[PDB]
A paper describes a structure:
SgvM is found in the biosynthetic gene cluster of the antibiotic viridogrisein and catalyzes methyl transfer to the C3 (i.e., β) position of α-ketoleucine (4-methyl-2-oxovalerate). The overall structure consists of a two-domain fold that assembles into homodimer in both the solution and the crystal. The N-terminal domain (I6 through H147) consists of helices that mediate dimerization, while the C-terminal domain (F149 through H338) consists of a Rossman fold. A single metal ion is located at the base of the C-terminal domain and is ligated by H244 and H296.
Author numbering:
A (entry chain A), B (entry chain A): 4 to 338
């Protein structure tokens, strides 16, 4: 009875916040694949009758899920068939983003590393990531750890036209357009799955007519820059690396094109990841992002120095790097 | 520059320990599937030359993985081709256990919930869990959150024979046998994949000749109790529920058989999960364990009361329940 109590206290300390985070991540990924999570908000209610119908789910099954999440403490039952997210839901979801990204989006790397180590080319085409999961997990991380700084920079200098390259689910644009009343946005992304997710999200935010989703590669922009011109700000979050080190020249043409297409006041903003940081706070997640990129995707992440170097030798001036909350995340501003 | 710093501090607080945990879980699951993690220990070294050969991996690929984990802060490079785990590695691995269990072992439930909601029978046979992942993730959680109390109870009363039903990777037995010099163990488990993992682990701990792994169902024990008799302690961790509510009678025969086969001093110890706790600490992970069991596996988790009730109406006396560190985990001792 003594040592049971001691084993209890010691175990609770060892486990720390991991039980809570493991449970939230699983409930939220499952609910997001169902389409339920888009209906969860601490300030709005989810009416099961309508949502079950909208999502084409048996209402009873939705109720059993929601009751499970209610037991977990992630939602509150407001009345019969009405639920709302717990007050700290957005932070819970943000943290789940990291877990979803490493454990869900990048699962093919985790499961099939042996293949990647022995025959990379065969592995790379056999074990492919689900870009809907890449884009969503990225959005959950972004909400609190990389969107806010870029949002605030974009909001000042009050743009009329914003282009986001490799936009994923288009959350940053939805946010920009929400904050500056007379703005248009174009979100560009190579993945059908991301684009479908985005169009849905954009519609859900009532901006379908203000914010266009165009399914194209960023490479496209080098030869067909007929999407940039008019833009006060061009943004690119975690995409530029997708053409390094293999398409260096294309990258430099996209950069040259960006410089041109800009209104005379505006800027390019690049959110991207720098490789293998050593500082205590950033190092562990930095290493995961770097290893997935380096080893599995064979994309080159550049250092701060290299990025600054490149934006200059692309004809941008006043280029600086800002530290983001997401480990090894950096914001580059090039005017 | 002001608001970048403010967005930084706010983002770091929002993210909390999630970046670190997400990265550790992914590195460790990946490394455990490779067979590397069994070689990681804060007190021993991993010699890449031998391990790469033992694991049938290109040594250079192992080195690149280990260097990534070193950058992450999870291993320390001792010299060329020598590495050891960071000092707090066991706690890191324990926490990764929770993430692995919810996000890896139970992945088929996360990805295919829609199917489970619409046609359960078809879903249950189409989307099946990898029991090697179930057993390993369970072991990582157990290390600090459910093995210690059962270990300490077993170690007292110094047994000669211990049987563990649904033993997974047999860590509890390996630990019991390690602490009481003249003990034999039998670990029983229905999953080939778990048994293979176990035999390997048992061999790695030099107990192959002391600890037998028998691939059988727990149901087996109802009709063929020729595995129990002689036992000072019978243990069963997170298996009993696998015959409820459908094989109630079989469960009661296994229980009756257990009562008989015991030496006159010994006891049955059951580690198992109670459903949907409400207390703040346990509720969130409790709900995940309960929802996976209830909804996806259709196994009945019993409350403390029900379990105590059952162990009595099986002819055990002096039955009590102890709180474990793993949320909604309970240890039942029946003599
Ligand atoms: N060559 C390419 N051209 C355009 N988009 C690309 C690309 N390679 C990858 N992408 C997209 O880039 C995104 C990377 S992650 C999502 C990033 C998003 N801007 C955000 O910050 O939340 C994915 O949506 C992926 O589909
Ligand atoms: N009907 C059954 N008979 C025997 N073992 C079973 C079973 N159903 C599931 N199992 C096994 O029970 C285990 C549940 S999880 C692992 C539990 C292990 N005792 C531990 O505490 O770490 C798995 O190894 C699974 O393969
Ligand atoms: O997945 C990719 O391809 C990326 O570029 C990852 C983008 C990212 C970076 C940090 C946290 C979450 C998401
Ligand atoms: O996966 C199963 O079937 C189980 O019974 C899970 C056993 C378990 C319980 C709590 C944490 C980790 C593992
Ligand atoms: Zn990337
Ligand atoms: Zn179970």
């Amino acid at each position: 009875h003594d040592i049971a109590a001691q084993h209890l206290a010691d175990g609770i300390a060892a486990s720390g916040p991991a039980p809570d985070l493991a449970a939230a991540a699983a409930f939220l990924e499952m609910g997001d694949r169902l389409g339920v999570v888009a209906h969860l908000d601490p300030d709005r209610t989810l009416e099961t009758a309508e949502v079950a119908a909208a999502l084409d789910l048996p209402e009873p099954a939705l109720v059993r899920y929601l009751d499970a999440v209610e037991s977990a403490g992630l939602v509150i039952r407001e009345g019969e068939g009405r639920y709302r997210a717990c007050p700290d839901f957005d932070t819970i979801r943000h943290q789940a983003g990291y877990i979803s990204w490493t454990m869900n989006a990048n699962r093919p790397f985790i499961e099939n590393a042996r293949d990647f180590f022995t025959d990379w080319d065969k592995a790379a085409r056999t074990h492919v990531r689900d870009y809907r999961e890449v884009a969503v997990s990225s959005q959950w991380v972004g909400s609190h750890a990389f969107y806010p700084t870029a949002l605030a920079t974009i909001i000042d200098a009050a743009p009329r036209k914003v282009v986001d390259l490799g936009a994923g689910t288009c959350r940053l644009l939805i946010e920009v357009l929400g904050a500056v009343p007379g703005s248009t946005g174009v979100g560009l992304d190579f993945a059908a799955d991301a684009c479908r997710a985005a169009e849905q999200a954009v519609a859900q935010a009532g901006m379908t007519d203000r914010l266009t989703v165009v399914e194209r590669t960023i490479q496209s922009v080098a030869t067909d820059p007929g999407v940039l011109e008019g833009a006060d700000v061009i943004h690119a979050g975690f995409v530029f690396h997708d053409m390094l080190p293999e398409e260096e020249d294309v990258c430099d043409q996209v950069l040259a094109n960006c410089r041109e297409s800009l209104a005379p006041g505006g800027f390019l903003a690049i959110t991207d990841a720098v490789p293998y940081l050593r500082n205590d706070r950033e190092r562990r997640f930095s290493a995961a992002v770097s290893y997935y990129h380096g080893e599995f995707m064979r994309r080159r992440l550049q250092s701060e120095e290299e990025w600054v170097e490149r934006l200059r030798g692309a004809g941008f001036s006043d280029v600086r790097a800002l530290t983001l909350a997401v480990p090894a995340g950096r914001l580059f501003l090039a005017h």
